[PDB]
């Protein structure tokens, strides 16, 4: 039970870190697109 609970929790900590980093790459696409449609 402890090693399963631990594996789950660690994987959820990392998945959320990657979700935050993927939203930055999403926001960066939006900024480079905003520059294009300004010109």
């Amino acid at each position: 039970q402890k090693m399963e609970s631990n594996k789950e929790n660690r994987e959820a900590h990392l998945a959320a870190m990657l979700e935050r980093l993927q939203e930055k790459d999403k926001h960066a696409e939006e900024v480079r697109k905003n520059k294009e449609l300004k010109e």
Binding site: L14, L18, L21, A28, V31, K33, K35
Partner: protein
């Protein structure tokens, strides 16, 4: 084991090159990468920073990055310039013109993929990568904007590794480029979320040390970087030489970072160019800090002290206990035993030296000073069109300011906190 070093932009590459010159001399590595030293202690942990090549050559695990070729041509011509791996030079032609948005979103995004190709090549041949250290300034466009983009991309591919920065904070006393506070605030917003440990190297403090203490009427970048290279040698001693304490990046982070966002360290050095009592008093003196913060204006969460040279370990222990006992008000009572001491036998042209790493709530003085200069410009939207021109919205400046003001509040919260 292995650390991968990245140096980004003009400042990053200038302080980066001095770092490699200084630690190559300490490890007995010459400019052709040959070992000509006199001690086994020099080679025991050489693999932390150097790769071994054909013919017992040592090659820095170093990647050199800029959007402008000029500074990297001068590195290649610098004394240790031939020691770097030629394929580890990654440069564009455009430049960033001190514009964070060009470094982070437009010019830098074009170059970042070829930097990651080199990072991946260095990372893949590591027995067991500890993580990364980046040297950069926060006041320009490449080191600031592209530096923080690289951190975000490296973290996406190596999320379980430690990310460490040597981050040079801007001052009106050294550059008269007026958008530096914008670039520094936008950079701090990235560093708060995406680094584990940041050494705050304040150009304000380096200028004041060169002027007031070392009596240099007209400090150059050369004079500033002499202080930076001595500090950087000091704070990496425990990573590079056999030893007990903070001997790898994760162990340092676990000793120094009680809350994930409060990872901005005030480095110190003594003597500024000596008995153990004098080293100890000087390394804790406001005048010896590489961040323009008075430690008596806050409290220490955590401290690492590193003594270098042949000296009495008994005298070092007694003096380190003396400073804590006599200054007990400036160490939070709810982190017991929060000051750790290392002694390394190899000194840096000195018989003895002390390097100080502090996680002090007084670091809020550095962020408040940047925040004041940011607001003075941002309230009149001065020069914003250079940033909106690259696709950024005003709201991203508002968010960066709020997050840096939140960081200040958080240092203040732990400063006021009490055990009872």
């Amino acid at each position: 084991r292995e650390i991968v070093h990245i140096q980004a932009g003009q400042c990053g590459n200038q302080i980066g090159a001095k770092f490699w010159e200084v630690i190559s001399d300490e490890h007995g590595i010459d400019p052709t990468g040959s070992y000509h030293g006199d001690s086994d202690l020099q080679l025991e942990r050489i693999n932390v920073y150097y790769n071994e090549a054909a013919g017992n050559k040592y090659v820095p695990r170093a990647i050199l990055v800029d959007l402008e070729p000029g500074t990297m041509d001068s590195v290649r011509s610098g004394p240790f310039g031939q020691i770097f791996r030629p394929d580890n030079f990654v440069f564009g032609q455009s430049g960033a013109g001190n514009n964070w948005a060009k470094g982070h979103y437009t010019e830098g995004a074009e170059l970042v993929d070829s930097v990651l190709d080199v990072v991946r090549k260095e990372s893949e041949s590591c027995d067991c990568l500890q993580g990364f250290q980046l040297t950069h300034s926060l006041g320009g466009g490449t080191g600031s904007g592209m530096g923080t983009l690289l951190i975000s991309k490296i973290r996406e591919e190596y999320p379980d590794r430690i990310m460490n920065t040597f981050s040079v904070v801007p001052s009106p006393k050294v550059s008269d480029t007026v958008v530096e506070p914008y670039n520094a605030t936008l950079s701090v917003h990235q560093l708060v979320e995406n680094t584990d440990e940041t050494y705050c190297i304040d150009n304000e403090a380096l200028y004041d040390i060169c002027f007031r203490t070392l009596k240099l009427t007209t400090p150059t970048y050369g004079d500033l970087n002499h202080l930076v290279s001595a500090t950087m040698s000091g704070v990496t001693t425990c990573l590079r030489f056999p030893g007990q304490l903070n001997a790898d990046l994760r162990k340092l982070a676990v000793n120094m970072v009680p809350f994930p966002r409060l990872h901005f360290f005030m480095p110190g050095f003594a003597p500024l160019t000596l008995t153990v009592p004098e080293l100890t008093q000087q390394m804790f003196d406001a005048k010896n800090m590489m961040a323009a913060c008075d430690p008596r204006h806050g409290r220490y969460l955590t401290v690492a002290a590193v003594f270098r040279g042949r000296m009495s370990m008994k005298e070092v222990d007694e003096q380190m206990l003396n400073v804590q006992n006599k200054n007990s008000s400036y160490f939070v009572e709810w982190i017991p035993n929060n000051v750790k001491t290392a002694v390394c036998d190899i000194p840096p042209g000195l018989k003895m030296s002390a390097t100080f790493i502090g996680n002090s709530t007084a670091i809020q003085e550095l962020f408040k000073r940047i925040s004041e200069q940011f607001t003075a410009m941002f309230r009149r939207k001065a020069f914003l069109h250079w940033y909106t021109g690259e696709g950024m919205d005003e709201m991203e400046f508002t968010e960066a300011e709020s997050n840096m003001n939140d960081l200040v509040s958080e240092y203040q919260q732990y400063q006021d906190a009490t055990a009872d």
